[PDB]
Design a protein around this nucleic acid. Structure first.
Ligand SMILES: [Mg+2]
Ligand SMILES: [Mg+2]
Ligand SMILES: [Mg+2]
Ligand SMILES: [Mg+2]
Ligand SMILES: [Mg+2]
Ligand SMILES: [Mg+2]
Ligand SMILES: [Mg+2]
Ligand SMILES: [Mg+2]
Ligand SMILES: [Mg+2]
Ligand SMILES: [Mg+2]
Ligand SMILES: [Mg+2]
Ligand SMILES: [Mg+2]
Ligand SMILES: [Mg+2]
Lengths: 137, 208, 107, 76
RNA sequence: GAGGAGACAAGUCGUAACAUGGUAAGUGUACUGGAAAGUGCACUUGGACGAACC
RNA sequence: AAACUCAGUUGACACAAAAUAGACUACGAAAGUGGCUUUAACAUAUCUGAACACACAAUAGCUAAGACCCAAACUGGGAUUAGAUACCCCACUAUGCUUAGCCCUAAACCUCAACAGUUAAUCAACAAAACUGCUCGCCAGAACACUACGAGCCACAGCUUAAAACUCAAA
């Protein structure tokens, strides 16, 4: 076989495994990188919450939350919690272009957890709601 | 500068000038041949080929100077070195043979090691992004690190807290403290490092 | 394949309303715009975390401090080599365009 | 044409100064102001050599004929 | 009687416009405000986005 | 700062708005039209032709009834400020939506009228090269003036048409 960047298809017979598990069963680390806060939540393959960590819960307040350093800190905390909950390999789904988008992943990894996949689930309306008006400064 | 651009700084090293001709690479032989036909400045009055010459101590004496009193500055430096050596000899003799193995008596080594200990690894520099300057932690060049160590040492000595204490004793005591990784200079270095770590969040404000 | 310009601008003999309203004329100029203008923070963060957990005693953080210093030296070397290498250039490109300039008029 | 594919300013200046101009014009040249255009290829080495040879030979013939005729008139 | 315009003409409070006029400007319309004017929706360039890749 | 104890995952769920396609330039008279399917449907074998009628006319706005995710004049609060009736942040309303009427205004601008034709001897400047024939509408210093009066209108702080007096040598 050869390496493919696409994920394995559920219901298809694939050879890839992680910790003796199939891709579908790997726990999911939902990152949410808002403009001024980066939240992280590691749920099991059955949406069972395992760990939580946010810039605010890490002690950062006000603008300091929206910093890659704060994202790294929150990711490290979440990774430690998940590691003590028994999580090795994770699938990462991040929804938001906030400053913590990548530093959160870096913190999560530095906390020990390995990442098998990165998923972007940023909400992109197909012209649904009307966002707030522009800013003139 | 009375020296025209053509003039080059002299090199003072008997070993370099006595190096065998066979040991010289093509480029080194070319460098020597080029210098054979180059203008050289006059040897500055501050350095010589003396085997006992120490550039670090020369620079420290220069930094300690006040108003071109090289004589007084050098006198203070030699007094400091003598005081350090005397203190070390006293400790050595009064100490047991076991710890005499560790007790060091070379004042030059003590001075070098104290300065190296005091050298601050990471500094705080103002960096401006978007029109607002912030004290970003930043790596420092070796020149700046050595200069900061020397300046902190000298300023700590010059402080008025030590009253009626002669500069030789002040500097010898502070140098010994630094060598044993204690004292106000080391405290200041740790304070700078602590401030840098506290402001670690602003590292990305750097662009270089 | 450059986007078509047939019937895109408000011109006589163009029944449809304009598609494009270029602020500046769409004529190639004889010049190109001038080239437009932190490093090694992982090692710094490692060293600073070691300092924080060890009370900044450099004695027990020697490997991290040395890595930080060497990384800074390599950053300086990278800056120097990049600068010398940077020194196709806009100047050369403008010279070539001058050699073969645009002709938006009739000779 | 000059080296930027524009008419040589000498054409305009010579027209200003009333100096007659013979000239090889390629299909992208402007023979409006050339007194004696010679529509032809001026970009090929063979063509340029041919033109140089022709003009050189004609000028030499004219000068030598002038010398011969001057001698003929002054020897009678 | 009071309003409106113009002119004359030095003041009072701001700086709305002309530069990216320091919130780009403006048209229509609605509400609001000493005051220029502010904001909401759509429209215009009678503004720009620096015009190879970065 | 104020504001909320609502926040994250998963699932269920609109009378709101219609990513990518679109680097396409099509449809319509203009305003406008870019999710999908279906029905009906896009006038004139000659061109011009409304202050002289008919039918349309974005956004805003009124009337009456519903929906209300989000956005949002006004309003309130938090900032900023010498002040802040603004710019910045938060909440919320009319309103944007559907239905039935009204309203009939836009920088409704491609500021370039319709039809037919030419690229030849150019052409104040800039802009989107210059013209020919024919027709309709419009214009005749600036400002007073998208004004007052008169008139018409489902319009009642409105819209269309629209002057004059005083003033200036400019605009
Ligand atoms: Mg040619
Ligand atoms: Mg202004
Ligand atoms: Mg403004
Ligand atoms: Mg406006
Ligand atoms: Mg308001
Ligand atoms: Mg008709
Ligand atoms: Mg009409
Ligand atoms: Mg309407
Ligand atoms: Mg509402
Ligand atoms: Mg329009
Ligand atoms: Mg009006
Ligand atoms: Mg009126
Ligand atoms: Mg009336």
């Amino acid at each position: 076989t050869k390496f493919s960047i696409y994920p394995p298809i559920p219901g298809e017979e694939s050879s890839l495994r992680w910790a003796g598990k199939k891709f579908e069963e790997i726990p999911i680390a939902h990152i949410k990188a808002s403009h001024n806060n980066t939240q992280i939540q590691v749920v099991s393959a059955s949406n069972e919450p395992l760990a939580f960590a946010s810039c605010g819960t890490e002690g950062f307040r006000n603008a300091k939350k929206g910093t890659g350093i704060a994202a790294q800190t929150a990711g490290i905390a979440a990774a430690a919690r998940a590691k003590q909950k028994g999580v090795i390999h994770i699938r990462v789904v991040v929804k938001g272009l906030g400053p913590g988008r990548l530093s959160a992943m870096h913190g999560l990894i530095m906390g020990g957890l390995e990442v098998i996949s990165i998923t972007d689930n940023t909400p992109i309306p197909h012209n649904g709601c009307r966002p707030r008006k522009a800013r003139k400064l | 500068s009375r020296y025209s651009p053509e003039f080059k700084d002299p090199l003072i090293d008997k070993e370099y000038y006595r190096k065998p001709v066979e040991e010289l690479t093509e480029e080194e032989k070319y460098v020597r041949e080029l210098k054979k036909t180059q203008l050289i400045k006059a040897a500055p009055a501050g350095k010589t080929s003396s085997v006992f010459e120490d550039p670090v101590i020369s620079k420290f004496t220069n930094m300690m100077m006040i108003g071109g009193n090289k004589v007084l500055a050098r006198s203070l430096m030699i007094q400091t070195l003598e005081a350090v050596k005397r203190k070390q000899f006293e400790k050595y003799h009064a100490a047991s043979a076991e710890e005499q193995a560790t007790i060091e008596r070379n004042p030059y080594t003590i001075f070098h090691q104290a300065l190296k200990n005091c050298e601050p690894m990471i500094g705080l520099v103002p960096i401006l992004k978007g029109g607002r300057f912030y004290q970003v932690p930043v790596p420092l060049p070796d020149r700046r690190r050595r200069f900061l160590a020397m300046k902190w040492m000298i300023t700590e000595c010059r402080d008025k807290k030590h009253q009626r204490t002669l500069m030789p004793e002040k500097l010898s005591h502070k140098l010994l403290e630094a060598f044993h990784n204690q004292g106000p200079v080391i405290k200041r270095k740790h304070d700078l490092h602590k401030m840098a770590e506290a402001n670690r969040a602003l590292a990305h404000y750097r662009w270089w | 394949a450059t986007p078509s310009l047939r019937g895109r601008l408000a011109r006589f003999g163009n029944p449809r309303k304009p598609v494009l309203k270029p602020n500046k004329p769409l004529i190639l100029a004889n010049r190109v715009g001038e080239r437009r203008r932190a490093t090694c923070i992982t090692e710094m963060s490692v060293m600073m975390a070691c300092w924080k957990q060890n009370e900044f005693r450099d004695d027990a953080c020697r490997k991290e401090i040395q890595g930080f210093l060497d990384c800074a030296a390599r950053a300086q070397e990278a800056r120097k080599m990049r600068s010398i290498q940077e020194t196709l250039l806009p100047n050369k490109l403008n010279k070539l365009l001058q050699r073969f300039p645009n002709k938006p008029y009739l000779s | 044409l000059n080296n930027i594919f524009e008419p040589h300013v000498a054409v305009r200046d010579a027209a200003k100064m009333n100096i007659p101009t013979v000239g090889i014009v390629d299909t992208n040249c402007n023979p409006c102001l050339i007194t004696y255009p010679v529509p032809g290829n001026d970009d090929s080495p063979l063509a340029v050599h041919l033109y140089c040879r022709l003009f050189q030979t004609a000028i030499t013939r004219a000068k030598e004929k002038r010398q011969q005729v001057e001698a003929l008139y002054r020897l009678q």
